[PDB]
Subunit: 408 residues, 4 copies
């Protein structure tokens, strides 16, 4: 079927110029740097070094180049990806980005100076589909800390390694009342859910028990690396030192969890707090965070490597929790109006999943009074407005809505 | 070339003629029923010609009016292509929940207390109108709280989200009112009472009830919908909590201006006392599953906004204090009622009704709860299951008060 | 040597005979009124002998004897300085100053949820005092009638405990203040109303009184009780207020239906009938003067100080004071208990019924209410009273700083 | 017109020309005063001098002359409880009746509490005139624990004033698990959160050791220099296991509930030290009696606390003294009271007396079972209740009148 692909792209010409193949490939939304295309691109480079002709691939030479990644290339070229007309869709992404750009309100988080420093005018959006198709607009290569955006990810790691039953013996599954917002613990002495601070503190104590903080951290970072397809994941020591210095509320919670015996036997509470502040201080960009979201969108498989990272159980539970508990006190309105699993963070990040379709990261630093990014909230509403993405939006009958699949 | 000739050749199986019984049998195994409103012209034509064996020309005369729907059915286009295998799975889950004898039948009124604990039905209607039933599926029972998503859908269809949500909130919560002096959501009693006062304002109760009943008829594709006066009289008599709620709503000025609150409570009780069966309630669920189109008639009944909102609310607040646990484990919008009904939606796939009177300590039906758990264990149907990658799970969209 | 004789000498001051007006003015300066029911023999005899006298208006030692003998004990306590406040004139002078200072406080808002409340003038302000010995004083608008409203709640609770006992009553109703985080809940965890001083507890207390008879008879029974507490001074009924109250009582109907749902009433209760009776009890009218005597009865352990009659059991009074202490001034109850330290009840007419146990009762009336629903003038007055005099619960009798002590000479 | 000392001598002499020392001493004890009373030191020093046998009008006068006012008060029956002997016999009955109340669990969160015997039971009384009585185990040291809370609040109000103190802490009962009220202030000095903030208030800008010395000296005055001490083993255990109090302290710190320059960790140390202060029933009754007496120590005469401090302290003890039981206790018992996890209840009867009751086993609410039973029995017997009428009471007895 390397043969068939040749005929498709050639346009009845004898030979295909390299740049024409590359251009057609990029228009699918794949990137030439995609890890699943490595053999093909290695072969194009090499044959460019060794070639008799200029840039022209004849049937035989194209076959040489694509054969190892032929299945993925034919999917791309046939239009079998989740969003077949990716170019049209990315143009829509850009307009929504421009519209949200206008929304100038909100306040940058200043409780530590690493958050305070960020310009209010930083605004980026990245997309990664479940087939690995990519796009980005605005400030999508600027590093920033996940903060509470790491909470679903470490809950995923916990459930993956340990199972639903073990995890939920320590942490609940439900949104607390709009009037149990300030309660550390529910009636069973369990924190309400893994997306509040007390719940995430307990989740942090479940991961990789019985090794030191360095190894625990290495384990989580290696896991984050796979979810992001080995795109950027780093660490802000400066952020960490600040979080630790001013984490009075989290120390309060940790002492209370200790008193109510909420930790697994043998836990060093102060050491778990330290780990917690480190996980908060992990750095991403919009582009790498979008792939992490897309992994969640894809049932636990990283769409740009094809690697199994998370179990189906881990992903399902994480999405359910992000649905109901992921946007602080705006979670109910968010679920009603947007209808997508989403997690916000105090850096202005919103990690957004569109199950079966794609993953997003939206970043801008000024926050609204709920602590959610202003541009990001406006973007997510506008995205649902446009597209049939909502949770309960009918796949066959959708009104004036467009359907891109169809054609701390 | 002909569409009808193509279908004739596939059913004939290269033989000279198709007997009528063979066509009917083949049609039934797709899940459609011969009383399907969309197949009426075909079935009328069959009646006429029968007044046993059909040839190309005669089959074509019978099927031509309904040829598109029939071709979808026979070319395995439906949402569940292998429906017989799926109904075999449904039957297994039914038998398993049947053995789950726990729970208590509600007895706050005599009409509820009368029902046997042994009654147990499950009905399915897909978004293509494919139908299955097991157990006690033609036994009328009161909707009770199951009517709450239906009347909220009506209110949002008629008035819009913005107007409705001036009076009632949109999030899961003892208290009658949130911080803003609105009831928390249309799914609780307080929100349902306020929703009831939004519908068809400025006409008497008798006209309001007629309007709602006509709307319900369309939702159920004209299958069974009725009303228990006896339940209504009992509900009114014994509804002290609802009167308490109503007088608090009035005090806090929660109703639209010109509201007679004691009249609204009567209408609310009547709406609670509406009767369905499993079969007809499954069609109303399928209407919700199908974007507001009724899958058996093809009629548009509810706006997309109304259905989306109703599903959102059924998700978070549909099964009393088990709503949180239910969302996490089952992952499907669902409403339960004190008669033991669970009205279950699987968006883009199907509508279900499960009925069994004994309730658990949360108010939800024992067998129905056990059923919905097992359904999701077996099938990829959870909201946050993945369509391309899922566990040991079966995907029936694919060929194997 | 005779009790009547010795009294004669002390008032006489060595003169052979006492002019009547001299006896009267001396009697009044103790703080008693000539209209006092326990003085009735004496005053009837003075009037009679005025008609029959050869020497009118002057009083012979044997004529004084004839006049005073029946009421000699009480008059000797008055004239000896054996009353709870011996220098009553100096005290009333202080009451006057505190009254004037409160008068100048002119913020607040007249209630207006019903037209009967609405219409009252914001500048009405009256204070009356009745000591535990029947000594009386009044300043400002103290003969103007107004509804008790929630000021009737400790009174109706007192009647319930009097007739039925603590044990029976508190099966139906709690003993504790709600808290701000159940400020809006009708029932506690045990499904009881939190205390008799909130509307839901008051409704339930209303259902306990004189069970088995019709509303007219229940009403009459409570009115006679009220008449006794007030020493037969003015106690009336506003039908206009009652009709208004039942018309706009959404809140209380909500509560009544919830109480019915949770089985909070005694077996056989007609809850809509109970609500009618409750609205009637809210609509009872007092003046400052008569309500002060009601508060004085509570100050005096259930005896009415101006008639000497036993009205309430010691248990009933003690319970009522304990509840008034902790739960009597809506959401200001905690702040009031800390700063004033006196059992007190407020009402939406701008009434504050105030007890100083073992000393006096008071009624403070002014209609404008602050945010908590308490009378602005009354609140200002209660704080000022406590600043001046050592009448806070936890003020000390032997040691107290720059406070004065009256007991010493010196809806 | 004969001397005050001569008048007193003839009344004790009962016609006889001379008085035996022992006869004077017996008579004096019968008024409830103790021969060790600090106000009687001069008299007892004089008796010690002359005795190294009968006294006569002159030696007697020489002995009692400088304490004659207090002695005359005692002998003429001018003390707040004139028939003290009869009253102490009622106290003994009440004691014996509560002795039979075997139930309750001794606290065991800390080893030092779990050591105590369930059968220890003492009650001490100190009247506002210094009259004393004790039954049971009343000279055994135990920790104040939360009984300390009204005392250190009293100290803070005395030194700093009502308005300063209550910028930091509220004045009201909450049934709540919340650390702070709607205003971000802890609810009242009587809860842990409030007591930790009141701890921060006292003697600011000196080291912990100096702060503790100051509180100890203040406790000494309150107890009229009777027993006060410190359990270091309780302090160490208290600190090692106080996770809830660290949780509170970190939350008070986030919410900026302390005065600027507070070292929160250091405050918690101080707070644990205050909890670990030891008293006896006897000495604790005196501290209660100071509270009952308006801030004056009844056995010394010293002005310990200001009237504002005492009044505020009593008000708070009334509403929030007895943990969850508070509202119930106020309704039935009607007395300012505090209680502690060691089984202590400090009880005040304003203008009459202070008590301390101690018995280690606790009911479900945290209060001592014998203690609670004794407080109910006192109030049903006598008419100590705060809304009990002084003229009119029905078959109650009025000893004021001669018959963590
Ligand atoms: O947040 C305000 C008022 C405010 C402040 C600022 C602005 C406005 C208003 N006040 C606060 N005070 N402290 C706070 C920290 C969390 S409460 C600390 C202790 C607990 N944490 N989780 C608990 N769970 C249970 O007790 C379980 C349970 C629930 C129900 C039944 C049984 C068992 S208790 S927030
Ligand atoms: O539910 C138990 C305890 C229990 C019972 C049984 C067993 C255990 C425990 N007791 C109950 N007592 N009464 C009940 C009826 C509903 S409360 C009545 C009036 C209100 N309805 N909604 C309101 N909303 C707000 O006032 C909004 C708001 C919230 C926060 C701030 C401002 C405004 S106030 S339930």
């Amino acid at each position: 079927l390397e043969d068939l692909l040749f005929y498709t792209i050639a346009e009845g010409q004898e030979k295909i110029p390299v740049h024409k193949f590359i251009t057609a490939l990029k228009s699918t939304g794949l990137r030439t740097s995609d890890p699943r295309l490595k053999e093909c691109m290695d072969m194009l480079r090499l044959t460019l070094q060794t070639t008799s002709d200029g840039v022209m691939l004849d049937k035989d030479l194209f076959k040489k180049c694509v054969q190892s990644n032929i299945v993925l290339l034919t999917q791309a070229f046939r239009r079998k990806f989740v969003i077949p007309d990716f170019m049209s869709f990315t143009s829509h992404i850009d307009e929504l980005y421009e519209s949200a750009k206008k929304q100038s309100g909100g306040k940058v988080a200043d409780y530590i100076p690493q958050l305070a420093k960020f310009s209010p005018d930083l605004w980026g959006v990245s997309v990664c589909t479940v087939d690995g198709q990519r796009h980005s607009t605005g400030d999508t290569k600027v590093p920033f800390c996940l903060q509470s955006c790491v909470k679903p990810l470490k809950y995923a790691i916990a459930v993956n390694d340990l199972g639903t039953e073990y995890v939920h013996r320590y942490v609940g599954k439900e949104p607390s009342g709009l009037r149990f917002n300030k309660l550390f613990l529910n009636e069973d002495d369990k924190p309400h859910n893994p997306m509040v601070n007390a719940g995430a503190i307990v989740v942090t104590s479940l991961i990789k028990q019985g090794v030191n903080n360095a190894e625990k951290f290495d384990y989580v970072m290696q896991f984050l690396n796979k979810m992001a397809g080995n795109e950027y994941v780093g660490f802000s020591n400066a952020t960490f030192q600040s979080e630790r210095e001013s984490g009075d509320r989290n120390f309060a919670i940790g002492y209370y969890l200790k008193e109510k015996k909420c930790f697994p036997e043998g836990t060093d509470m102060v050491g778990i707090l330290d780990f917690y502040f480190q996980l908060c201080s992990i750095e991403v960009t919009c582009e790498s965070a979008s792939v992490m979201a897309a992994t969640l969108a894809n049932g636990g498989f990283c769409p740009i490597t094809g690697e199994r990272v998370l179990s189906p159980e881990a992903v399902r539970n994480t999405l359910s929790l992000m649905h109901s508990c992921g946007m602080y006190d705006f979670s109910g309105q968010f679920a009603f109006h947007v209808g997508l699993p989403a997690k916000s963070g105090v850096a202005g990040g919103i990690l957004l999943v569109v199950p079966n379709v794609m993953g997003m990261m939206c970043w801008s630093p000024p926050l609204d009074k709920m602590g959610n990014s202003v541009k990001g909230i406006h973007f997510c509403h506008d995205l649902v407005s446009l597209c049939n993405f909502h949770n309960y939006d009918n796949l066959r009958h959708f009104a004036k809505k467009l359907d891109p699949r169809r054609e701390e």
